Amino acid sequence: KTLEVWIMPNSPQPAEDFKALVAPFEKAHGVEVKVTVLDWGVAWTKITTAATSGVGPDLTQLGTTWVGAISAMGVLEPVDDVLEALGGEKAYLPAVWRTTRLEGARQATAVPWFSELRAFYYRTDALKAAGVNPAEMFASWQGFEAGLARLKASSFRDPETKAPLAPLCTPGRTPRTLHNAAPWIWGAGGEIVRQAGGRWQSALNSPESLEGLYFFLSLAQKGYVPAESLEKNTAQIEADFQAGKCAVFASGPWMIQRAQVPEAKGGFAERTAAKNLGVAPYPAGPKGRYTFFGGSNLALFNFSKNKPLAKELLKYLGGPEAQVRYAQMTGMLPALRSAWSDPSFQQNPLLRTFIQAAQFGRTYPSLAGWGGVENLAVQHLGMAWDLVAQGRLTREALKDLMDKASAAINQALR
Numbered sequence: 001k002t003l004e005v006w007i008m009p010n011s012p013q014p015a016e017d018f019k020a021l022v023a024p025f026e027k028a029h030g031v032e033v034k035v036t037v038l039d040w041g042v043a044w045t046k047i048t049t050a051a052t053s054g055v056g057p058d059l060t061q062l063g064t065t066w067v068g069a070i071s072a073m074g075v076l077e078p079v080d081d082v083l084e085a086l087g088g089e090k091a092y093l094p095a096v097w098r099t100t101r102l103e104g105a106r107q108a109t110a111v112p113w114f115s116e117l118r119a120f121y122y123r124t125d126a127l128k129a130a131g132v133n134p135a136e137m138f139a140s141w142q143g144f145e146a147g148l149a150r151l152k153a154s155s156f157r158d159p160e161t162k163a164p165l166a167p168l169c170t171p172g173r174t175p176r177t178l179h180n181a182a183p184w185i186w187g188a189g190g191e192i193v194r195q196a197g198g199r200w201q202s203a204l205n206s207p208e209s210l211e212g213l214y215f216f217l218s219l220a221q222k223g224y225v226p227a228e229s230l231e232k233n234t235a236q237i238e239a240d241f242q243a244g245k246c247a248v249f250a251s252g253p254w255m256i257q258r259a260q261v262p263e264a265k266g267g268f269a270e271r272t273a274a275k276n277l278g279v280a281p282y283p284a285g286p287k288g289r290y291t292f293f294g295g296s297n298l299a300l301f302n303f304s305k306n307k308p309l310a311k312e313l314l315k316y317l318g319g320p321e322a323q324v325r326y327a328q329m330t331g332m333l334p335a336l337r338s339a340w341s342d343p344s345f346q347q348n349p350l351l352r353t354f355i356q357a358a359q360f361g362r363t364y365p366s367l368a369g370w371g372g373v374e375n376l377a378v379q380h381l382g383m384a385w386d387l388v389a390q391g392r393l394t395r396e397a398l399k400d401l402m403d404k405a406s407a408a409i410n411q412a413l414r
């Protein structure tokens with residue numbers, strides 16, 4: 001018996017770490033688990049070819065935001081039984097439980113595996129040298145912009161690069177997702193889509209959504225984000241933070257683990273950034289504190305010839321011991337509420353900042369058409385960033401771009 005699992009690159013040697021995690025299950029049940037690692041950039045294509053063809057693994061990792069679209073294709077085995085075995089709805093944060101199904105589906109189709117949410121990593125040495133108090137900078141939008149202003153003024157140079165640091169690094173290349181933009185939209189009192197009047201419609205062009213987006217993109221326009229950063233993607237900016245080029249950058253909890261791994265092992269432990277690392281939550285906007293809350297679930301294809309063994313592997317991967325172990329190896333958070341108490345999470349002060357930020361986590365609605373919506377939003381946001389690269393983003397230019405995105409999103413939501 002060989003069980004097939006597809007996963008994404010959740011740790012530095014992702015297949016080895018997954019193989020170590022399931023070894024006790026393999027021994028107990030007399031099976032080999034065969035793992036395939038898919039890069040995030042292609043995983044959606046490969047999982048959808050599997051859905052449409054009926055040729056694929058037993059289990060796949062799914063980003064939480066993908067569960068609705070794959071569920072709607074009718075290729076996922078119901079897993080209400082597995083979720084009840086793991087303690088049901090009470091065992092999960094609502095933000096996680098909502099990811100277990102297509103919104104308005106009668107059955108669960110994904111088992112929570114791990115959670116992650118976004119916060120700001122910052123250079124403790126750089127904010128000190130600029131006289132920025134992080135408790136002020138990360139409190140409000142006003143604090144944030146004043147902190148970046150001090151950081152632009154600062155005479156600080158990285159000890160390794162002997163060069164200045166960008167106040168804020170954020171990618172300007174057309175993004176794959178709204179994860180970076182979402183907290184700004186939400187903090188202004190906006191949303192990406194809104195349910196009202198028996199339907200979902202775009203809200204990207206609401207006055208609140210546009211205030212949040214404009215506030216965010218205009219930081220770069222004011223010189224707090226260098227031109228070089230506008231020409232990079234998320235991975236490039238992450239490498240730039242590691243390499244000592246950025247004072248502030250937003251990411252998830254995994255960067256804490258990577259900071260304890262040597263560079264030659266896929267981390268940045270030797271680097272000045274690893275030795276001077278802080279974490280602060282997203283600042284409150286005018287309408288409050290929000291961050292993107294996501295993670296990954298596991299799903300079982302209903303064409304699997306190994307559903308019994310696969311359901312036992314889902315209960316194993318979703319249960320307390322494996323929850324702690326995998327989160328320890330990846331730097332993610334457990335999906336199961338009870339596993340957060342482990343001292344490897346609670347006694348880690350940077351991760352404690354992420355745990356506290358989870359109070360303000362916000363998810364996307366689990367819609368069948370979510371990917372279509374997010375893809376039209378990011379195409380138009382990429383045009384917005386291209387105007388920032390000219391210094392020509394106006395409120396009117398942004399509104400016109402979000403009015404076009406909204407027309408297209410509304411047409412897709414019909």
Ligand SMILES: OC[C@H]1O[C@@H](O[C@H]2[C@H](O)[C@@H](O)[C@H](O[C@H]3[C@H](O)[C@@H](O)[C@H](O)O[C@@H]3CO)O[C@@H]2CO)[C@H](O)[C@@H](O)[C@@H]1O
Nearest residue numbers: 009010011040063064065066177234235238294295296
């Ligand atoms: O949009 C799909 C899903 O995204 C999930 O976030 C992942 C990002 O898409 C992915 O780019 C990022 O990759 C990390 C990687 O885990 C890490 O090992 C490497 O060092 O850096 C990469 C970042 O450049 O991982 C995250 C977390 O898995 C969301 O969590 C999910 O909700 C969403 O559907």
Ligand SMILES: [Cl-]
Nearest residue numbers: 175180181381
């Ligand atoms: Cl963005």
Ligand SMILES: [Cl-]
Nearest residue numbers: 191192193364
């Ligand atoms: Cl939203």
Ligand SMILES: [Cl-]
Nearest residue numbers: 175176233234
């Ligand atoms: Cl990207």
